[PDB]
Amino acid sequence: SGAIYVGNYRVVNRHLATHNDWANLVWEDSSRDLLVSSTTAQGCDTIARCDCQTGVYYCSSRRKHYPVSFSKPSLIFVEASEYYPARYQSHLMLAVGHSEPGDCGGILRCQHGVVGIVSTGGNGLVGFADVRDLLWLDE
Ligand SMILES: Cc1ocnc1CCNC(=O)c1nn(C)c2ccccc12
Ligand SMILES: [Zn+2]
């Protein structure tokens, strides 16, 4: 689990969005596994605006943060789970690292701010849904 709080928005994995997230829907993209809902409280996370390929992510299944190198956001085939059939996921970044399903929502951060959230994984790889292109999160 996990979310990003920036301005009047909450960014979550679309497969983990709650009934309240869907009732306050701002934008969602199934191919990205992202959903953004509106909030009453102002959030103060900072979204990175950069092309970094190194950063640190939180891994709840190890209670640890790990530094990784990751690929630029791209269209990648992702195997099925109970939440989606196998399909191409867009704006996905991969790194070598540990993850389990419940690690979704863990934040990846570089020196500039939040890069994305854990979304996929397996075989020693962890995939992150990028948020750096969503310029509207700051306005
Ligand atoms: C976005 C997406 O695509 C398909 N199902 C999902 C959503 C469900 N995701 C997973 O099942 C999953 N997430 N991570 C980090 C893992 C690590 C090891 C094994 C499985 C997973
Ligand atoms: Zn950066």
Swiss-Prot record:
Disulfide bonds: none annotated. Zn(2+) 1 binds at residues 50, 52, 110, 112. It catalyses: Selective cleavage of Tyr-|-Gly bond in the picornavirus polyprotein. It comes from the Viruses. The active site is at residues 15, 33, 104. Homodimer. Cysteine protease that cleaves viral polyprotein and specific host proteins. It is responsible for the autocatalytic cleavage between the P1 and P2 regions, which is the first cleavage occurring in the polyprotein. Also cleaves the host translation initiation factor EIF4G1, in order to shut down the capped cellular mRNA translation. Inhibits the host nucleus-cytoplasm protein and RNA trafficking by cleaving host members of the nuclear pores. Counteracts stress granule formation probably by antagonizing its assembly or promoting its dissassembly. This is Protease 2A. It comes from Coxsackievirus A16 (strain G-10). The chain holds residues 869 to 1007 of 2193 of the full protein.
